[PDB]
Amino acid sequence: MFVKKGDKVKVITGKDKNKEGVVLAAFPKQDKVIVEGVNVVKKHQKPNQAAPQGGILEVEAPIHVSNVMVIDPSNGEATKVAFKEVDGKKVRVSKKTGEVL
């Protein structure tokens, strides 16, 4: 999906613009992604098997995948991603000076 489940990522659009975080889960075929600490939401649960005291709880919500950008692990600036011919495990070979991501 051009973004994987273990991955550091920066946010382009939507109220968390400029935040970073490690990807938490990938949902292909709906093209969304959960990022750590990024789209916090407040629910209201009644007691059930998990947390028999259901308070007002807060977890992340999935954002759309094109609101996101990969970060080169070694250098730290967000990059568009391209594919090139290494010994034939084709990996995302970063733009912005041809390094492996």
C-alpha dist (Å) from residue 43 to 54, 55, 77: 10, 8, 35
Query: Residue 23, CB half-sphere, CA atoms under 13 Å: how many?
Result: 23
**Residue 5 CB, nearest distance to RNA (Å)?**
3
**67 within 8 A of 14, measured Cβ to Cβ:** yes
Q: Is 2 in the site for RNA (CB under 7 A)?
A: yes
Residue 64-93 contact track with RNA, rule CB under 7 A, x = bound: xxxx-x----------xxxxx-----x---
- Can you count the helices (H) and strands (E) in the chain? 0, 10
Exactly one of 46, 52, 97, 98 binds RNA (CB under 7 A); that residue is 46
Interface residues toward RNA, by CB under 7 A = 1-2, 4-5, 12-17, 25-29, 31, 41-47, 49, 54-56, 61, 64-67, 69, 80-84, 90, 95
